[PDB]
C-alpha cells in the first residue's frame, strides 16, 4: 500500500469519536465476538486494524493531543492482534460493557490461565463412557445418575497464574467447558487528554473528596 | 532469494556447552557425554570465534549456503543432545496374534509376529537405549540422529509389503517422532 495514507485516514477517524480505546481482539472467536461487533456498529462506534497504523503515533500527536497521542501513550502499542475501538460510550460504560462480554473463551492448552478453573457438580448429560474414568483419576467423585454420567461434587482444580495442562484441558473440553477464561483485554482507553486504565476506571476520585 | 555474499553464519552456544575445533572437525562436550562429528565440505573453514561457532567461506555460492545452514543445525541438535536425551515412542499394534517385543542383546527381537517361529530384528546402537514397558516401547538416547535411526530401523523390519497393507497391519509403528509421521 503506502505509509501515512492509512495513518491519515485513521487520524481523521479518531477525531470524530470522543473515546478511542485499544483492546486485544486476538483472544476471542467469532460468533460471540461477531454478535457484539454488530451490536457496537448500531450503538455508534466501529472496530478497525491494519498491520502498522497502531504505530506512527507522531502524526496522531501532531494532529491533536486529545485522540491517540504520544502524551501518555508514550510507548507505541502494537500487540499481537490488537484492534482499535472507537466509540461514544464513556470510558466507565465502555469498561463495564467489556467486563460482561468476554466469554466463552477459546481452548488453547498449555497456557497459564488468568482466572480460576473449576469443575462443578451436576450431570454432564453424557452417557457412560471413558469420561467417568477420567474424573476418577483426578480424584473427583462420580456416579451414574439419569442413566448419564454425573459429578457428585465439585472442586476447584487450579488457581490463577497456574497452567492448564493438556490432560486437564482435555477433561474441561470433554465436559464442554473452556479451560481458559481469557477474553478481550483493554490495553488502554483514551478520552479527551486523559488516559483511562482499569485501575483509573475502578476508583472514583469524588469518593475520597467526600470522606475527607 | 537469500542475500548473502560474505557468506558467514553465526551459531549461538550457551556457557553450558563448550565447543573446541581442530581442523574441519567439531567436538561438542557438555554435561551428558560428548559427541564428535566430521563436517565434510571442501573449501569451508569452521572455527570457534569466542562464544560463537562460525561457519564461513569467502566465495558464496548457492550450494555452499545450504551446506552452512545444515552444519549449523547439526551443532544445535548436538547442543540439545549433550544437555538432555531425545525420546521417540513407538506402539506395537496387532491384527491377531499377541506379539512379544523384548530387547535381547544389542538387537531388539520381535517374536510371535503373525504366529512366526522366526525373529524380526532391528539394530540398537550403544548411544541409544531401548526400554520396553508393556506394549509401549520407547527409543531414547543422546543424539537426535542416533535416536532417529534406531527408532526407524524397528518400523521398517516389521513393515508389511508381503501382503495387503490395509488388512495385514500387525507390526510396531512410529507413534511419536515429534509429531505423527507421515501422511500425504
Amino acid at each position: 500500500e503506502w505509509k501515512k495514507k492509512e495513518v491519515e485516514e485513521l487520524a481523521n477517524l479518531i477525531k470524530s469519536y470522543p473515546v478511542v480505546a485499544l483492546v486485544d481482539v486476538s483472544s476471542m472467536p467469532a460468533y460471540p465476538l461477531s454478535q457484539m461487533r454488530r451490536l457496537i456498529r448500531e450503538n455508534n462506534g466501529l472496530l478497525r486494524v491494519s498491520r502498522n497504523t497502531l504505530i506512527e503515533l507522531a502524526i496522531k500527536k501532531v494532529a491533536q493531543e486529545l485522540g491517540k497521542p504520544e502524551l501518555e501513550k508514550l510507548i507505541n502499542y502494537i500487540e499481537g492482534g490488537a484492534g482499535i475501538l472507537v466509540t461514544t460510550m464513556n470510558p466507565f460504560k465502555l469498561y463495564k460493557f467489556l467486563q460482561q462480554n468476554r466469554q466463552p473463551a477459546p481452548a488453547k492448552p498449555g497456557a497459564k490461565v488468568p482466572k480460576d478453573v473449576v469443575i462443578p457438580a451436576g450431570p454432564t448429560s453424557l452417557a457412560p463412557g471413558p469420561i467417568v474414568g477420567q474424573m476418577q483419576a483426578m480424584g473427583i467423585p462420580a456416579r451414574i445418575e439419569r442413566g448419564k454420567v454425573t459429578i457428585q461434587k465439585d472442586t476447584v482444580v487450579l488457581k490463577a497464574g497456574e497452567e492448564i495442562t493438556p490432560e486437564l484441558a482435555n477433561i474441561l473440553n470433554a465436559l464442554g467447558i473452556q479451560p481458559l477464561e481469557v477474553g478481550l483485554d483493554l490495553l488502554a482507553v483514551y478520552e479527551d487528554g486523559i488516559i483511562y486504565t482499569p485501575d483509573v476506571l475502578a476508583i472514583d476520585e469524588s469518593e475520597y473528596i467526600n470522606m475527607l | 532469494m537469500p542475500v548473502d555474499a560474505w557468506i558467514r553464519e553465526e551459531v549461538e552456544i550457551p556457557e553450558g556447552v563448550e565447543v573446541t575445533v581442530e581442523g574441519y572437525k567439531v567436538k561438542v562436550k557438555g554435561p551428558k557425554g560428548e559427541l564428535e562429528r566430521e563436517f565434510f565440505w571442501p573449501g569451508i573453514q569452521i572455527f570457534t570465534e569466542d562464544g560463537n561457532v562460525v561457519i564461513y567461506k569467502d566465495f558464496p555460492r548457492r550450494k555452499d549456503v545450504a551446506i552452512a545452514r545444515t552444519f549449523a543445525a547439526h551443532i544445535r541438535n548436538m547442543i540439545k543432545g549433550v544437555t538432555e536425551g531425545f525420546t521417540y515412542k513407538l506402539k506395537v499394534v496387532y491384527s491377531h496374534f499377541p506379539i512379544s517385543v523384548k530387547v535381547q542383546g544389542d538387537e531388539v527381537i520381535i517374536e510371535n509376529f503373525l504366529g512366526e517361529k522366526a525373529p524380526r530384528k532391528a539394530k540398537i546402537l550403544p548411544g541409544v537405549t531401548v526400554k520396553v514397558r508393556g506394549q509401549e516401547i520407547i527409543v531414547e538416547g543422546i543424539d537426535k540422529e542416533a535416536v532417529g535411526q534406531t527408532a526407524a530401523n524397528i518400523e521398517q523390519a516389521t513393515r508389511i509389503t508381503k501382503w495387503d497393507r490395509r488388512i495385514f497391519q500387525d507390526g510396531i509403528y512410529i507413534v511419536e517422532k515429534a509429531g505423527k509421521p507421515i501422511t500425504f
Binding site: - | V93, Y94, I160, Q169, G171, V175, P181, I182, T183
Partner: protein, 45 residues
Amino acid sequence: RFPEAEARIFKKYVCLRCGATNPWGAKKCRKCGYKRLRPKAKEPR
C-alpha cells in the same frame, strides 16, 4: 492398528514415471520431471 500402519507404510506418493514409492512432497522420483502424474490408489482411495 489401522491408522498407525497406514501412514508409515501407505502415506507417501508413487510416481508413474519410475514405479517406486517416493516422498510425498516430491513430484518426481529424484529426477524424472513431470508429464501429468496422479496417485497411486484408485477406485477405493
